[PDB]
Design a binder for this molecule. Structure first.
Ligand code: HEM
Ligand code: HEM
Ligand code: HEM
Ligand code: HEM
Ligand SMILES: [K+]
Ligand SMILES: [K+]
Lengths: 156, 156, 156, 156, 156, 156, 156
């Protein structure tokens, strides 16, 4: 079904953000696992999987709309060097992701692509839930102290 | 455990090949699904998952050896425009992957990193299994005809 | 709960499209079954049942909004004479149906009938899935040949 | 129990034919699997297993009759280069085998070795069933065409 | 996948050793069963089956590497005339097999056919397990006496 | 089966290292249990058992190769007196152990004892898993602080 | 709980005896397994395990009493070269062990370490059970002859 060219451009932009997130979260997961912070590693692994599922749906939607999914262009991964930085890197990424999702939803609405809008809204709900998690972790580091926070994330 | 710097470079190079293949096979899978060739789409999805698992193991090995996994530098995806082309693109990628695997194994052997060698040998066994599958599909297209071959791959 | 009069008019227009689709898809189903193409016959039956469920929900919404559902005025059935024509007739109907659905959503949004919009978005998702199915069938006819395509739809 | 010398010679000749068939069918099975014709590959594997079981019983009978089973002399394997040739190679071998079985049964009857006769009759029944299969496959190649015939033997 | 021509020659040489062992061990098994030494007969049967499985894997590897498996050129079976000779004939055969396996692995390693090497290594582990069994049996014949050793192998 | 004399000397050297590790880990386990650090105690017990299993396989291999396993010449145990030193003592022992394993594998490869090499490779994989655990634990003490680290290991 | 210094020295002497017995019984077990005498191998393995469990209770008691368990000094292993010698070597060790256990119990009684006495009495009961087994095996060899005795210990 021939989709709107600019919708497909927006879907490829969102897809690009998801492809960054997949790799960034997966590396952060395996870094936390390497450091013995297995609760963080497991949670971050599930974040990466969730972004994979979003990327899948975007690819499927782009192809149904007769566009070409772009899995070639990979933007800048924000890789931290310690737990505080890694969480903030994920948070910085997610805030760019939600800006772009809101702009894509506007455009879907204007060309009456209400199904693509509904998909993007679902992805946006998932990204805001990730923001909630991240902001909460950063707040907990302040409330319990960094050593306690990390200790609490050693064991699953 | 401090690894050989050149081993780590080889492992990042293999990881780079797996990252290409993850994206190429995943896109090929969703294209075949979109065209109604669901048996191909499902098979190619499982190939993409297999590459994801190899990438995971490579990432974990690099970190254990105190290297920096490189998920940033994505190489060229070989995307076909029809089934015959897509299969040949996968095969071309696999032949490059196995050449690089052999060179990495040689080096691991020379520096006595026998555990990295064992990992890469397992990955090489998986890639040769993919080559077998790909060569066989191309052969079947010649034996049964393209139209029959595609017909046989419509339904799961 | 007294609804917007033009919303009710749009809902009755969507219902009119669903009532055409029920009969067209049911007759095509039974034609394919009579011809021994039982996989087409069964899939088309399920498409007709889906339209019946949509019509049900539209009738219920119209009555809740204190309008009069119009089940009396049946528009033109597009009945094919062979498989390719029947599929294209279904696709022509669906493209008209999605056009009307989008115009109805616009009007729901403008007068703040957000629940009617949500119902119509869900129906639109179902109709786009049928379009995907129909487009894929027509494409498969070109990839495997009509004779193979019909062969693959003889048996459930 | 001391058997007739010529009966034992016949049994060793039948054994020699089965030993050829084991290897021929096993190699054909693995050729078909390598080509992705897994249904032919699996069926031919079962034909090879059936010949293994006959060879076992012949070896046991020879040893009971105080003869020396000959597993050393292996006659000529008829290996085809395509599916039609492999099937005909199997058939030609089976037609020789049943001729030799009939001559061995004649001699068993003459010297009153009714138990060896019964064994050979059971083996002959298996070989005629294999002939039925082979002639049927070659007939189906003619009825449905080679491309369809091979298509129908891709998947188990 | 086109393999190294000398690798393929080594694989056919290993395959030829497996084919001798299949026949030698099967015949020894059935001789022991005929003599009422059913525990030896059963264990020897399972040795033959294991060699059949190795032969299968070699045939498959050879075909994947685009060589022609040789099931035609059967070398010399070493058939004993009593239990002590049969075991020693098996051991003599296994010691030649392991020599040939080691030389094949050397070459696989030199030309980087690491998957063929892995297969050969697995086969060599099975062959060394058989050597262990055979050497132990000959030691037991000394330690318990021939009469007791045979008595211990009458019943399963 | 007569083994290479120097291979057997390497195997006895690896055995000696496992024999040290069995006792060191078992004592460290029981010290941690006595101190109320039961999670360390249990994990360290499982490390000792794994070393026991490696020593068993080494003894079995040495005897098969017709060597004399040396369980008499116990080398120096590295017994720590607090948690951090105990972990570092285990790490120091493992680093010596993997150095010896690599030298033994080199020699196995040179004399073509590929089964001994495969055994030592499996043992090296286990010791590298232990190194990974140990390095992770020492890193955790730095990240969460010694008092929290110990706290987290009081309870199973 | 600070224990009597000479009690602790006795406990370490008993521990030393158990440590010799662990290795001596484990090697004898694996020697019998290598020779095909698996019932002897299995029983001697279970004797080695029993001594391992005694050593564990002695290590735990010494630590509780605030002594230092000595796992470093290994006394002389009495390794036999044939079954009779191996059993007698085990018996000679056990008789030295029970002599040392009796002197240890005398001293525990004198200084009122009744709990250590109870542990040593339990170990003494196990060692006297092992002496029973060993004396009985040596007696059976005399009654049934070594060849029959070994025959009866081939299969588990
Ligand atoms: C560095 C790149 C990637 C890595 C390391 C990775 C890793 C993984 C792993 C380990 C799994 C679990 C496999 C299993 O055990 O079953 C998985 C699942 C999955 N991946 Fe990826 N992946 C990557 C990229 C992608 C991309 C780019 C996509 C899609 C565009 C994707 C789509 C999926 C899906 C759909 C699943 C299954 C999720 C489910 O459980 O439903 N992955 N991935
Ligand atoms: C040509 C006109 C129609 C035909 C031939 C037809 C046929 C059928 C058939 C054969 C079934 C399955 C019943 C069963 O076996 O249990 C069914 C179910 C149903 N029909 Fe129709 N129908 C028609 C029109 C309609 C209309 C106009 C509506 C609503 C406005 C409707 C609503 C439904 C509903 C709600 C179901 C139950 C579906 C479910 O939940 O499984 N049908 N119809
Ligand atoms: C090229 C030579 C041969 C090959 C590749 C081969 C291969 C095989 C394989 C793969 C199996 C199934 C094993 C399993 O997974 O359980 C099998 C079974 C068997 N083979 Fe062979 N074989 C060969 C020769 C022989 C010969 C020469 C004999 C007898 C003289 C024989 C007797 C049997 C028997 C009795 C079975 C078990 C059948 C059953 O399931 O009852 N085979 N063979
Ligand atoms: C030559 C040195 C040793 C060898 C080869 C050895 C071997 C073994 C083996 C093979 C097992 C069974 C493991 C399994 O499959 O789960 C085991 C268990 C065990 N070992 Fe050792 N071991 C040795 C020394 C020791 C020592 C020195 C101690 C204590 C100081 C010890 C304490 C234990 C314990 C407590 C068990 C568990 C027994 C049970 O409850 O089942 N072992 N050993
Ligand atoms: K705390
Ligand atoms: K006896």
């Amino acid at each position: 079904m021939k989709g709107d060219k600019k919708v497909i451009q927006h879907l490829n932009k969102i897809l690009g953000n998801e492809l960054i997130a997949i790799n960034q979260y997966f590396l952060h997961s395996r870094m936390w696992n390497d450091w013995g912070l297995k609760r963080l590693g497991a949670h971050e692994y599930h974040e990466s999987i969730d972004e994979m599922k979003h990327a899948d749906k975007l690819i499927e939607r782009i192809l149904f709309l007769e566009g070409l999914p772009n899995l070639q262009d990979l933007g800048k991964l924000l890789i931290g060097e310690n737990t505080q930085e890694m969480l903030q890197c994920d948070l910085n990424l997610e805030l760019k992701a939600t800006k772009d999702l809101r702009e894509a939803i506007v455009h879907c609405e204007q060309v009456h692509d209400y199904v693509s809008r509904d998909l993007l809204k679902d992805i946006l709900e998932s990204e805001e839930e990730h923001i909630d998690y991240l902001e909460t972790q950063l707040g907990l580091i302040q409330k319990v102290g960094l050593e306690n926070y990390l200790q609490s994330h050693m064991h699953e």
